[PDB]
Design a protein around this ligand. Sequence first.
Ligand SMILES: [Cl-]
Ligand SMILES: [Cl-]
Ligand SMILES: [Mn+2]
Ligand SMILES: [Mn+2]
Ligand SMILES: [Mn+2]
Ligand SMILES: [Mn+2]
Ligand SMILES: [Mn+2]
Ligand SMILES: [Mn+2]
Ligand SMILES: [Mn+2]
Ligand SMILES: [Mn+2]
Ligand SMILES: [Mn+2]
Ligand SMILES: [Mn+2]
Ligand SMILES: [Mn+2]
Ligand SMILES: [Mn+2]
Lengths: 191, 191, 191, 191, 191, 191
Amino acid sequence: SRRARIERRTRESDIVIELDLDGTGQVAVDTGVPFYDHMLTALGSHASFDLTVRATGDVEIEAHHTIEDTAIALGTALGQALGDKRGIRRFGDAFIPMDETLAHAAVDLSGRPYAVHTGEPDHLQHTTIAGSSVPYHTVINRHVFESLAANARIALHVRVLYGRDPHHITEAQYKAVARALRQAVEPDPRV
Amino acid sequence: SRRARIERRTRESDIVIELDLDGTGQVAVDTGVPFYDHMLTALGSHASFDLTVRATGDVEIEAHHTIEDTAIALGTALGQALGDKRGIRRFGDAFIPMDETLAHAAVDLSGRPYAVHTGEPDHLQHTTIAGSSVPYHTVINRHVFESLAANARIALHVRVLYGRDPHHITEAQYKAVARALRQAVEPDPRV
Amino acid sequence: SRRARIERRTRESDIVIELDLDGTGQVAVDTGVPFYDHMLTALGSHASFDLTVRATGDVEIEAHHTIEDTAIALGTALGQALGDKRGIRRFGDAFIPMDETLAHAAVDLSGRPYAVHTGEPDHLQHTTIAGSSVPYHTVINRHVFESLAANARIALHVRVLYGRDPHHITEAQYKAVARALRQAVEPDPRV
Amino acid sequence: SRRARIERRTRESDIVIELDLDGTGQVAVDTGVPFYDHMLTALGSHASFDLTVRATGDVEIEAHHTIEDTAIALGTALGQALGDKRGIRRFGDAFIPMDETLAHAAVDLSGRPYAVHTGEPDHLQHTTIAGSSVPYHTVINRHVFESLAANARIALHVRVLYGRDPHHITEAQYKAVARALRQAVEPDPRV
Amino acid sequence: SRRARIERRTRESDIVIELDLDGTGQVAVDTGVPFYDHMLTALGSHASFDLTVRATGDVEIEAHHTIEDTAIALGTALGQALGDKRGIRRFGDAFIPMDETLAHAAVDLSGRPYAVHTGEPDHLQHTTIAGSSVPYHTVINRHVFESLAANARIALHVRVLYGRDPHHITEAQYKAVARALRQAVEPDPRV
Amino acid sequence: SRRARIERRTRESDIVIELDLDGTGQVAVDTGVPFYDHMLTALGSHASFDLTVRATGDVEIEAHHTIEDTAIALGTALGQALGDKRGIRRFGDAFIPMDETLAHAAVDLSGRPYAVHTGEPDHLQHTTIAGSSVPYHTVINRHVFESLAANARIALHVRVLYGRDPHHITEAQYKAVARALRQAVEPDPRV
Ligand SMILES: [Cl-]
Ligand SMILES: [Cl-]
Ligand SMILES: [Mn+2]
Ligand SMILES: [Mn+2]
Ligand SMILES: [Mn+2]
Ligand SMILES: [Mn+2]
Ligand SMILES: [Mn+2]
Ligand SMILES: [Mn+2]
Ligand SMILES: [Mn+2]
Ligand SMILES: [Mn+2]
Ligand SMILES: [Mn+2]
Ligand SMILES: [Mn+2]
Ligand SMILES: [Mn+2]
Ligand SMILES: [Mn+2]
C-alpha cells in the first residue's frame, strides 16, 4: 500500500491531497485555477495515480500561492507514499510529443532533492493562459516542478526540446513528468 | 511618538493612511488591487510599522491611478511621521532572497528626494499579475518606488540583482524597501 | 486481433498492405525500390509487426510516387489496425545507435496527426543511395514519416542527434520509428 | 534553547553533529578532510555557534561523499535547532573581504529551500587545494551550500563579487554564509 | 546461463573478471583505484549484474593502464556472456539525473563495435578526482567507454546533456551505461 | 578607552591627528584642502568618531602630499586606537545612496592590509573639484583609501555601484567607509 493524505493550511491557502501511487487514473482536482486543474489532472492520470486535490486559496491576488502550496503538498504526498522506496525502478523518463512540441522528463526517486528545467521558449516567461476564470501564468511551470522536486525529495529534470504553443508546451511537460514518475515508482522485478 | 494620518482625495481616488513607524507589524491594506494589497502588507509588516491603508479609486480604467495615489499618500505619511529625523540611523539597506530572486534596497532618510531602480528584467515592463480581481501591471513597480521617495523626501535605491518569476521579483523588492526603511528609522544609540 | 489489409490503387501505383500489430517480425516487402524495401523490412521487423507490402508504381519517373503511396497506405493500415486504441501504452520512443549515427523517434498514438523531423544533416537533402536497381533519394525520408503520421493519425517526431553516413542515418531513423511504435502499441497493463 | 544533535550513517560515511545556535564559537570539526575542517570551523566560529562535527567516510575515493554527507547533516541540524523560527530576524547578510577577494551571502531562514551561487571564477571548477592529507576540490563549494540550504530548508544566496586566490575565494564564502546565518538567527526585539 | 570468467595478464596488470548478466547486483570491485572501484560498482549494481573484479597493476605510473586493462577485460566478459544474443531486447538506453547533471547512454548489443562520447564539459579533460589513494583522471572516462565497446563488440553512445560537478558527471555516465545495458540484455518476450 | 594621538612631520607636511573610536561625531578638520576637509569631516562624523585633524603641507605644488600624509597618519591613528581588536564586530559594511550615486564599503579590521577600489567612473581619473582655495583631484580618492588601509592594517574594499556627479561619487564613498568602520569597531556582544 503506497498512499498518503496531506493537509496543508497556510495563511494563503487550504489544501487536501489524497494520493495512491498504485492507482488506475482516478483523478479529481479542484484548485480554483482551471488550467492548473487540467495540468494536475493530466499528471495524475498519465502517472496512473489515483489522486484527489482540493485547494482553496487567495486567487484574488493571483494563482501563484495556490499553485505553489498545492505543488508543495503534492510533492510531500508523493515522498510520503513512496515510503522506503525499496524494490522500485527508481529511475524513469518519458518523451511527450504534442503536435509541434516535444518535451521530456527524467527522474531519480532516490536522488537528492534537485530540479533542472531547460529549453522552455522565452515567451513562456510572460505568457498567460486565460479563460473565464482565474488565469495561469506559464512562468510558474518552473516553480511547480521545483516545488514538487523539493518536497518529494527527488531529482526531476524537465526539458522542452522544441515547441511553440504555450498550452502544448506546458501540457507536454506535465505529462512527461507524469510518465517519468509512473515508470520510476513501478516495482522493479530484479531489485 | 512617530505617527501620521494622511487623507488624500483626488478626482481618481480617495485614500486614508494611518502609519506608526514604531509598530509591531499590525497591518491592514485594502486598495481594490489585491496584489498591491499583498505588496503593501508585506511592506508594512517587514518594516515593523503599524499601517492601515484604505483606498478606493478608478479601477475600471486600471490600477495605476489608485496605486500611484496610494504610494504618494504613503510617502507623505512616512515623511510626516519621521518628523525632524533626529537621533535615527538615517541609512538602511536590506537584501531579500526569494527562491531564485535576489533584490536589495538602500535608503538615506535625510537625503534629497531621489529614486533609482535598476536590474529588473525587461519582461517586467509588460508583465501582468492577474487573479480574480483587478490586475497588477509590474511596470508600475518603478513608479511606486519613485512616488514613495518623492513624497517621503528620501533617497531610495532599489536593485534586482537577478531573478525570473515576476511575483518573486516584485515581492522581494517591496520587502527589501521595507527592511531598509526598518533599519533606517530606528533610533541610533550614538546620535 | 489488430490486423488490417489496405489496397490502394492510384494512377501512379498499385499497393497492397497486410499488417498485424501483434506479430513476430514476419515481414516481406517488394516495392520495386530495393533500398526502400530494406527500410520498410527493418521497420516491420523491429516493430515486431507481421507485414507484407506489395507495391508496383511508376519508377521510370523515380521512386517518389511509389514511396509516398506505400507510406500513405501503410499509415492507413496502422491506424485501422489500432482500432479504438483502448488499453495501449499510447506513448513510445526509441534511441538507435548505428555506428557513428544516433537517431531517436517519439510517438503519441492518440495524438493529432503531426510529424516533426529534425537534425538530419544537410547533405541528405540531395543524397542518392544507388545500387543495381531503382535508386533512393534520401530527401524523401522526411516525406515518408510525414505520410505515415498523416494517415495513421498519430504524432511522430523523428530526430537525428548526429551522424554521417546516409545509409546509417536513414536506417537508424526507420528503426527508431519502428521501436517507438512497438512500445506504443503494446497493451498497457494499468490502463 | 536552540540545540540539535544529528547522527547520519550511510554506506559512505558516519557523521555526528552537535549544534547550538546560541553559542560563543566553541567549535571542533574533524571530517578527515583538513581544508574542509578549516572551512566548517570558520563557519561555526564566525556564526557564533557552538559546533562539534565528527565525520568518517570513504576518503580513499575522494572527499566528495564525506563533504556532502556532512553538509546534509549540518543543514538538518540547523533546521532542527531553529525550531519554529518565531521571534528571529529571519533575514541576514554579510560581506567578507579577504585580501583581494570580496564575497557576500544573503539568507532567508523562513524561505523555501533554495540555493543560488554566482560569481565564483571559472578556475574554481577544477582547482584542488592540496596539503599532506585528503585534498579539497573547490568545485564542491557550490554543492556544500546547496546541501546546506536543501536540508536546513532555507534560501541561501552566495556571491563572489571578485577574487583570485582559491583559498581566499572559498574561505570568504564560508565566512559570509556564517555571518549571514549569525544575523538571521538572532532574536528580533520587534517580532 | 549467461556468465563469463575472464583472466587477462599483461606486463602492466593482472585482471580477473567474473560476470553474470542475470544477477541481482552482487558486486565486488578492487582495482587499486578506489574512484574507479566506485564507478564499476555502480555499473555492475545498476546493470543488475553479479560482478567481481580483481585487478592489480602499475599504479605507481598512474591508473591509466589498470583502468584500460580492466575495461578491456570487462568488455570481453560482457561479449562472451552475451553468447549468441538470441532473444534479447538488443537496444537499451537510460537517462540519469544526478543533482545538476543529466547523462544518457544508448546501446545496440548486436551493433558493430563503436563508441561515441559527446557533451562532457571541457574541464573534465584535465580534472583529477583525488582522495587518500591512487587518483582518477576524468579524461579517462571516454577511454573506458571506448574500451568496453571495442571488446564487447557493441555500439555504445554516451552523452552528457549538461552538468558541472566532475564526480556527478562521471558517475551519471557510468550509471547510464549500466541501465542501458540492463535494458538491452533482458529477454525480449516477442523475439 | 580607544584613543590615539599621531604626529607625523615629513619634508612635505606636518600633521596632528587625535582620534577616539568611541566618540559622538565631534570632528574638526583643517588640512588646507577644503574639499578634503569636508570629506574627512564626513568620515569622522558618520563613523561616530571624535576626530581632530590639523595638517599643513606643500599645497603650492598641489594637495597630493598633504592628502596622502594625512591619510597615512589617520590610518596609523585608527590602527593604534583599535589596540588588540578583542571583542569587536571586526567586519562592517555600508551602502550610501547620494542622489543618483550608490557607493558601498566593506571592511575586515583584523584582515591583512589590503585595499580594492572598483566601479568609480573613468572621468574621476582626471576630474578636479575646485573652489576658492586649493583644489581636489578626484584621482586621489583611490590613494586615500589605499593609504588608510595600508597604515591601519585592515582590508578595505570600496565600490561605486553607479553614479555621475563627482562630488556625490566621492562623498558617498567616504561616508560608506565611515559607516563600515563604525559597524566594524563596535563591541560585539557575543565575542
Ligand atoms: Cl535527448
Ligand atoms: Cl552588491
Ligand atoms: Mn513562490
Ligand atoms: Mn489541453
Ligand atoms: Mn503615473
Ligand atoms: Mn507572495
Ligand atoms: Mn510527394
Ligand atoms: Mn542497411
Ligand atoms: Mn554529490
Ligand atoms: Mn585559511
Ligand atoms: Mn590507453
Ligand atoms: Mn559517488
Ligand atoms: Mn602618492
Ligand atoms: Mn558635499
